[PDB]
Amino acid sequence: NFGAFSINPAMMAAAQAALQSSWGMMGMLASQQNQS
Amino acid sequence: NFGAFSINPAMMAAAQAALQSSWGMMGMLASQQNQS
Amino acid sequence: NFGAFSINPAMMAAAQAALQSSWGMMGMLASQQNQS
Amino acid sequence: NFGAFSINPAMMAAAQAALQSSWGMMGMLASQQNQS
Amino acid sequence: NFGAFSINPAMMAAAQAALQSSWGMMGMLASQQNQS
Amino acid sequence: NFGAFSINPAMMAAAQAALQSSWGMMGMLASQQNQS
Amino acid sequence: NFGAFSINPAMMAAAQAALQSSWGMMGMLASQQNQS
Amino acid sequence: NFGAFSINPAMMAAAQAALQSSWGMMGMLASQQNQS
Amino acid sequence: NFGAFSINPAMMAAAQAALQSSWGMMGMLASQQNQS
Amino acid sequence: NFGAFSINPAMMAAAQAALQSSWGMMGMLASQQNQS
Secondary structure, three states: OOOOOOEOOOOEEOOOOOEOOOOEEEEEEEEOOEEO | OOOOOOEOOOOEEOOOOOEOOOOEEEEEEEEOOEEO | OOOOOOEOOOOEEOOOOOEOOOEEEEEEEEEOOEEO | OOOOOOEOOOOEEOOOOOEOOOEEEEEEEEEOOEEO | OOOOOOEOOOOEEOOOOOEOOOOEEEEEEEEOOEEO | OOOOOOEOOOOEEOOOOOEOOOOEEEEEEEEOOEEO | OOOOOOEOOOOEEOOOOOEOOOOEEEEEEEEOOEEO | OOOOOOEOOOOEEOOOOOEOOOOEEEEEEEEOOEEO | OOOOOOEOOOOEEOOOOOEOOOOEEEEEEEEOOEEO | OOOOOOEOOOOEEOOOOOEOOOOEEEEEEEEOOEEO
């Protein structure tokens, strides 16, 4: 049903630059329940 | 039914620059229930 | 049903640059329950 | 049902650069329960 | 059901560079319970 | 500024019952950037 | 600024019952960047 | 700034009961970057 | 800044009961970068 | 900055009971990088 999901940041820092980044709590989760 | 979802920020910082970014709680989740 | 998900940041630091990054809590998780 | 998920950051540091990175709590986990 | 998941960072450090990295708590874990 | 947030589901299953539940991607995340 | 967050499900299963539950990707994460 | 976060599920199983549970990828993670 | 986080499930199994549980990938992780 | 984190499950099994539990990949990890 579902996809396939890429994550690809480019990230460049020049001469006297300052850069931060962060990622958290990302992904796939699912449930099934099947009863006679 | 569903997709496939890319995430790709470009991010550039010049000479005396300051840059921050953040990401959280992103993804796919689904449920099924199937009963006789 | 689901995908296959790549993660690939490029990351470049110039002459006097400063760069940080971080990642946490990423992946796949699922559940089944099946009862007669 | 599920994928196969690559993780591959490229990471370059120039002449007087400074770079940090981090990763934690990433993977797959699942459950089954099956009762007569 | 599941995948097979590669991890392969490239990592380059130039002349006067400084680079750190880290990884922790990554893998697969699962459970079964089966009752008559 | 913020709270403190409890999560406490009660959950009861009778004689021949069937019950599933799930939770994912829940928490707090924040950012600061402070520049002279 | 922030809280302190309890998680405490009660969970009861009767005579011939069936019950499943799950939790994933929950917690706190934050970032600082401070530049002269 | 942050809390202190308890996790304490109660969990009871009666005579012919069946019960499963699971937890994964939970905790705290943070970053600092400080540049002259 | 941060807490101190207890984990304490109670867990009871009656006469003919069946019970499973699981935990994985839980803890604290952090990073610093400090540059002149 | 951080805590001190207890883990203490209670766990009781009655007359004809069956009980399993598991824990893995739990702890603290951190990084520093400090450059002149």
